[PDB]
Amino acid sequence: AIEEGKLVIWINGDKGYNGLAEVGKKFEKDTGIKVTVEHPDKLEEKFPQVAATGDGPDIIFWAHDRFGGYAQSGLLAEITPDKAFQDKLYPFTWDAVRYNGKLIAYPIAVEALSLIYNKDLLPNPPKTWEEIPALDKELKAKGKSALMFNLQEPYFTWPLIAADGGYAFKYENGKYDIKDVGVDNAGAKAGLTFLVDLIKNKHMNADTDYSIAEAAFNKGETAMTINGPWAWSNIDTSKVNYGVTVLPTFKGQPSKPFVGVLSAGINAASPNKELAKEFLENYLLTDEGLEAVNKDKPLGAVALKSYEEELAKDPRIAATMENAQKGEIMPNIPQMSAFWYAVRTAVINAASGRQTVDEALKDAQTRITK
Numbered sequence: 068a069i070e071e072g073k074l075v076i077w078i079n080g081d082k083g084y085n086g087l088a089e090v091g092k093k094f095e096k097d098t099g100i101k102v103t104v105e106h107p108d109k110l111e112e113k114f115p116q117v118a119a120t121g122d123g124p125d126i127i128f129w130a131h132d133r134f135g136g137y138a139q140s141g142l143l144a145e146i147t148p149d150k151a152f153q154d155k156l157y158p159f160t161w162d163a164v165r166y167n168g169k170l171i172a173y174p175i176a177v178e179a180l181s182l183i184y185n186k187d188l189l190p191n192p193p194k195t196w197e198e199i200p201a202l203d204k205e206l207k208a209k210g211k212s213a214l215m216f217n218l219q220e221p222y223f224t225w226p227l228i229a230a231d232g233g234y235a236f237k238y239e240n241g242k243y244d245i246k247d248v249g250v251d252n253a254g255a256k257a258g259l260t261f262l263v264d265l266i267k268n269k270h271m272n273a274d275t276d277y278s279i280a281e282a283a284f285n286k287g288e289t290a291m292t293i294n295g296p297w298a299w300s301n302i303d304t305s306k307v308n309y310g311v312t313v314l315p316t317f318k319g320q321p322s323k324p325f326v327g328v329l330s331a332g333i334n335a336a337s338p339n340k341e342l343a344k345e346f347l348e349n350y351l352l353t354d355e356g357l358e359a360v361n362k363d364k365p366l367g368a369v370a371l372k373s374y375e376e377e378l379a380k381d382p383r384i385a386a387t388m389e390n391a392q393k394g395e396i397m398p399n400i401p402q403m404s405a406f407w408y409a410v411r412t413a414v415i416n417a418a419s420g421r422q423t424v425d426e427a428l429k430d431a432q433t434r435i436t437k
C-alpha cells in the first residue's frame with residue numbers, strides 16, 4: 068500500500084527531475100507535505116507492475132500514449148479539474164488524457180515535428196512540399212541537398228501522408244472508432260505517392276534514416292530536416308545557423324504531425340489524490356512551476372496557455388505548437404500499435420519498390436482494421 072501524508076513522484080531520467088524537485092520544495096514549504104522525486108530505470112514497465120499491487124508512486128509522468136494502457140487496467144484515478152482550470156490548457160491536450168470518456172491525467176508538455184532549416188543555405192524555406200523538387204535541383208548545383216529526414220519510422224513520414232486526408236483512427240465525440248481507419252484512402256495515397264516520387268526522382272534516398280539525416284544537417288550538407296524539440300540540443304553544438312518553422316503544406320493542406328503530450332497521472336491506489344491534485348494544478352501547472360522544470364531541461368512547448376505564450380517568444384517553440392495544433396494527438400488505444408507497424412512496412416515497401424503505393428496502403432489498411 069502507498070504511504071499517506073506525502074507525495075512520491077516518478078518521472079523519466081531524461082526529464083528535468085532536479086527542476087521538478089524545486090517545485091516539490093515550494094509545495095512542502097507551503098503545506099509541510101514532503102514531495103519525493105524519483106527516476107527509476109525502465110519506469111514505464113515498472114509502474115504497471117507495482118501499481119497493479121496497489122503500490123508505486125502517487126504521481127507518474129510519461130507520454131500520454133502509454134496512459135491508455137494504464138487506464139485500461141484501472142491504474143489511474145479519474146482527475147477532477149474544474150472548468151476554470153480546464154480553460155487554462157489548450158483543448159487538444161485534454162483529448163490526449165481522456166480514456167473511455169474520463170480524464171485520467173494532467174497534460175504538461177506538447178511535442179510535434181517541425182521543419183528545421185539552415186538559414187545560410189535556405190533563408191526563405193518553402194511553404195509547400197511541391198516546391199521542394201525545384202529547390203533540390205538548385206541546391207544540388209552546389210553539392211547540397213534540399214531535404215533529408217528519417218524515412219524509416221512512420222512517425223516522420225505521416226505528416227505528409229496525412230496532409231491531404233490520411234488518418235489513423237477517426238476520433239468522434241468521445242473516442243476513436245477502430246472501424247474507421249484512413250490509411251487506404253485518396254489523401255494518404257496522394258501523400259505517399261509524393262513521397263515515393265521524391266525518391267524515384269532522386270530528391271531523397273529510401274535508406275536515409277535518423278542518424279544519417281542528423282549528421283547531414285549538422286554538417287551543413289542538406290538545407291532542411293524534419294525533427295522534434297528533443298533534437299535541438301544536438302544541433303546547437305554544431306553551430307550551424309538554424310531556424311524552426313511550420314511544416315510545408317501539400318495540396319494546399321497543412322501537414323499533420325502526430326502530437327505527444329507528456330502527462331502526469333495519479334495512481335488509483337494513492338491515498339493522496341487530493342494532495343496530488345493540489346500539487347499538479349496549483350504548483351506545477353503555473354508559470355513558476357513550469358519555468359522551474361523547463362529551466363532544468365526544456366519541455367519544448369507546454370499545455371499551459373499562460374506559460375506557452377511566454378515560451379513562444381522562442382520561434383522554435385512557437386513553431387512546435389503551431390505544427391502541433393495542425394496535427395493530431397497520438398491515439399491512446401491498443402490498435403495504434405498495429406497502425407505503427409503496418410504503416411512502417413507500407414512506407415518502407417513503397418519507397419524501396421517492393422510494393423506499389425496502392426498495394427502498400429491497401430495491405431496496411433486491411434491489417435489495421437482486423
Ligand SMILES: OC[C@@H](O)[C@@H](O[C@H]1O[C@H](CO)[C@@H](O[C@H]2O[C@H](CO)[C@@H](O[C@H]3O[C@H](CO)[C@@H](O)[C@H](O)[C@H]3O)[C@H](O)[C@H]2O)[C@H](O)[C@H]1O)[C@H](O)[C@@H](O)CO
Nearest residue numbers: 130132178220221222223277295297327397404407408411
Ligand atoms: O529517434 C529517437 C526517438 O525515439 C525520439 O522520439 C520521438 O520520435 C519517435 C519516432 O521515432 C516518436 O515515437 C512515436 O512514433 C513511433 C513510430 O514511428 C512509435 O513506435 C511504435 O512503432 C514502432 C514501429 O515503427 C515500434 O518499433 C515501436 O515499438 C512502437 O512503439 C512510438 O510509440 C510513438 O511514440 C516519439 O513520440 C518522439 O518523441 C526520442 O525517443 C525522444 O522522445 C527523446 O529523445
